[PDB]
Design a protein around this ligand. Structure first.
Ligand SMILES: CNC(=O)[C@@H](c1cccc(C)c1)N1C[C@@H](C(N)=O)CC1=O
Ligand SMILES: [Zn+2]
Length: 140
Protein backbone atom coordinates (compact mmCIF):
# COMPACT_ATOMS: atom_id res chain seq x y z
CA UNK A 1 0.00 0.00 0.00
CA UNK A 2 1.00 3.67 -0.27
CA UNK A 3 0.26 6.96 -1.95
CA UNK A 4 1.82 10.25 -3.14
CA UNK A 5 0.30 13.36 -1.45
CA UNK A 6 1.03 16.43 -3.65
CA UNK A 7 -1.07 19.60 -3.39
CA UNK A 8 -4.71 18.55 -3.01
CA UNK A 9 -4.14 15.25 -4.84
CA UNK A 10 -3.69 11.64 -3.64
CA UNK A 11 -1.94 9.35 -6.23
CA UNK A 12 -2.49 5.61 -5.70
CA UNK A 13 -2.28 2.34 -7.67
CA UNK A 14 -5.66 2.08 -9.52
CA UNK A 15 -5.99 -1.55 -8.37
CA UNK A 16 -5.75 -0.43 -4.67
CA UNK A 17 -8.12 2.59 -4.92
CA UNK A 18 -10.79 2.84 -2.16
CA UNK A 19 -14.51 3.77 -2.48
CA UNK A 20 -13.60 7.25 -1.18
CA UNK A 21 -11.00 7.56 -3.97
CA UNK A 22 -13.61 6.65 -6.66
CA UNK A 23 -16.17 9.04 -5.06
CA UNK A 24 -13.60 11.96 -5.21
CA UNK A 25 -12.02 11.01 -8.56
CA UNK A 26 -9.79 13.39 -10.52
CA UNK A 27 -8.26 11.01 -13.15
CA UNK A 28 -7.65 7.30 -13.71
CA UNK A 29 -5.85 5.19 -16.31
CA UNK A 30 -5.99 1.37 -16.23
CA UNK A 31 -3.15 1.03 -18.79
CA UNK A 32 -0.83 2.87 -16.32
CA UNK A 33 -2.27 1.35 -13.06
CA UNK A 34 -2.83 4.91 -11.72
CA UNK A 35 -5.70 6.78 -10.05
CA UNK A 36 -5.74 10.27 -8.58
CA UNK A 37 -8.34 11.52 -6.08
CA UNK A 38 -8.88 14.91 -4.40
CA UNK A 39 -7.94 15.64 -0.73
CA UNK A 40 -9.12 18.16 1.84
CA UNK A 41 -5.63 18.71 3.33
CA UNK A 42 -2.51 19.78 1.34
CA UNK A 43 0.29 17.20 1.02
CA UNK A 44 4.06 17.52 1.35
CA UNK A 45 5.44 15.41 -1.50
CA UNK A 46 6.92 17.23 -4.55
CA UNK A 47 7.09 15.62 -8.01
CA UNK A 48 10.43 15.24 -9.83
CA UNK A 49 10.58 16.93 -13.27
CA UNK A 50 13.69 15.25 -14.75
CA UNK A 51 15.12 12.27 -16.70
CA UNK A 52 16.90 10.51 -13.73
CA UNK A 53 17.46 6.75 -14.11
CA UNK A 54 18.82 6.28 -10.55
CA UNK A 55 16.93 6.76 -7.31
CA UNK A 56 15.69 5.05 -4.12
CA UNK A 57 12.46 3.14 -3.48
CA UNK A 58 10.61 1.96 -0.36
CA UNK A 59 10.04 -1.80 0.00
CA UNK A 60 7.39 -2.57 2.69
CA UNK A 61 8.14 -6.33 2.64
CA UNK A 62 11.71 -5.50 3.85
CA UNK A 63 10.99 -2.24 5.84
CA UNK A 64 13.87 -0.78 3.80
CA UNK A 65 14.72 1.86 1.18
CA UNK A 66 16.95 0.54 -1.64
CA UNK A 67 18.99 2.44 -4.23
CA UNK A 68 18.18 1.33 -7.78
CA UNK A 69 18.97 1.95 -11.45
CA UNK A 70 15.73 1.90 -13.52
CA UNK A 71 14.72 1.91 -17.19
CA UNK A 72 13.01 4.79 -19.02
CA UNK A 73 9.15 4.75 -18.98
CA UNK A 74 8.03 2.20 -21.55
CA UNK A 75 5.28 -0.19 -22.71
CA UNK A 76 6.01 -3.56 -20.97
CA UNK A 77 4.15 -6.88 -20.96
CA UNK A 78 3.07 -7.76 -17.41
CA UNK A 79 1.82 -11.26 -16.47
CA UNK A 80 -1.66 -11.98 -15.09
CA UNK A 81 -2.38 -11.21 -11.45
CA UNK A 82 -5.59 -11.15 -9.29
CA UNK A 83 -5.97 -7.44 -10.37
CA UNK A 84 -5.38 -7.53 -14.15
CA UNK A 85 -5.12 -10.12 -16.96
CA UNK A 86 -1.72 -10.46 -18.75
CA UNK A 87 -1.41 -7.21 -20.72
CA UNK A 88 0.83 -4.33 -21.76
CA UNK A 89 1.24 -1.63 -19.06
CA UNK A 90 2.40 1.81 -20.24
CA UNK A 91 4.74 4.38 -18.62
CA UNK A 92 6.36 1.55 -16.59
CA UNK A 93 10.06 1.52 -15.50
CA UNK A 94 11.85 -1.70 -14.40
CA UNK A 95 14.69 -2.22 -11.93
CA UNK A 96 16.38 -5.09 -10.12
CA UNK A 97 15.04 -5.15 -6.57
CA UNK A 98 12.86 -7.11 -4.18
CA UNK A 99 9.11 -6.75 -4.47
CA UNK A 100 5.89 -8.62 -3.41
CA UNK A 101 2.30 -7.64 -4.42
CA UNK A 102 1.60 -5.59 -1.22
CA UNK A 103 4.73 -3.48 -1.91
CA UNK A 104 2.61 -1.56 -4.52
CA UNK A 105 2.37 2.10 -3.51
CA UNK A 106 5.91 2.48 -2.19
CA UNK A 107 7.58 5.68 -3.48
CA UNK A 108 10.53 5.81 -5.91
CA UNK A 109 12.37 9.16 -5.57
CA UNK A 110 15.43 10.90 -6.95
CA UNK A 111 17.33 14.07 -6.01
CA UNK A 112 14.49 16.16 -7.63
CA UNK A 113 11.52 14.60 -5.81
CA UNK A 114 8.98 11.75 -6.30
CA UNK A 115 9.40 9.82 -9.56
CA UNK A 116 6.64 7.20 -9.24
CA UNK A 117 5.20 4.31 -7.19
CA UNK A 118 5.77 0.53 -7.10
CA UNK A 119 3.26 -1.17 -9.48
CA UNK A 120 4.71 -4.57 -10.62
CA UNK A 121 7.45 -7.13 -9.67
CA UNK A 122 8.56 -10.70 -8.91
CA UNK A 123 11.71 -12.76 -9.50
CA UNK A 124 14.02 -10.07 -8.27
CA UNK A 125 12.47 -7.29 -10.44
CA UNK A 126 10.39 -4.29 -9.35
CA UNK A 127 8.40 -2.05 -11.77
CA UNK A 128 7.36 1.56 -11.07
CA UNK A 129 4.50 3.59 -12.55
CA UNK A 130 6.06 6.93 -13.63
CA UNK A 131 4.31 10.21 -12.68
CA UNK A 132 6.93 12.75 -13.98
CA UNK A 133 4.93 13.50 -17.16
CA UNK A 134 1.71 14.43 -15.17
CA UNK A 135 2.46 18.14 -15.05
CA UNK A 136 -1.04 19.04 -13.82
CA UNK A 137 -0.21 17.44 -10.40
CA UNK A 138 1.75 20.73 -9.69
CA UNK A 139 -1.26 23.09 -10.09
CA UNK A 140 -5.02 23.76 -9.23
C1 LIG B 1 2.78 -10.44 -12.69
N1 LIG B 1 2.22 -9.89 -11.47
C2 LIG B 1 2.72 -8.79 -10.92
O1 LIG B 1 3.61 -8.11 -11.43
C3 LIG B 1 2.04 -8.35 -9.61
C4 LIG B 1 3.07 -8.07 -8.52
C5 LIG B 1 3.91 -9.11 -8.13
C6 LIG B 1 5.00 -8.87 -7.32
C7 LIG B 1 5.28 -7.58 -6.91
C8 LIG B 1 4.45 -6.52 -7.26
C9 LIG B 1 4.72 -5.14 -6.74
C10 LIG B 1 3.34 -6.79 -8.06
N2 LIG B 1 1.11 -7.24 -9.87
C11 LIG B 1 1.39 -6.20 -10.87
C12 LIG B 1 0.24 -5.22 -10.69
C13 LIG B 1 -0.10 -4.56 -12.01
N3 LIG B 1 0.26 -3.28 -12.13
O2 LIG B 1 -0.55 -5.21 -12.96
C14 LIG B 1 -0.89 -6.08 -10.10
C15 LIG B 1 -0.14 -7.17 -9.36
O3 LIG B 1 -0.59 -7.94 -8.53
ZN1 LIG C 1 15.60 13.44 -10.82
Amino acid sequence: SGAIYVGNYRVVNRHLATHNDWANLVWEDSSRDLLVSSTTAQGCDTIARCDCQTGVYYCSSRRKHYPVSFSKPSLIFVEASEYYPARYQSHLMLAVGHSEPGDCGGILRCQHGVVGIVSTGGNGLVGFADVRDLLWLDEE
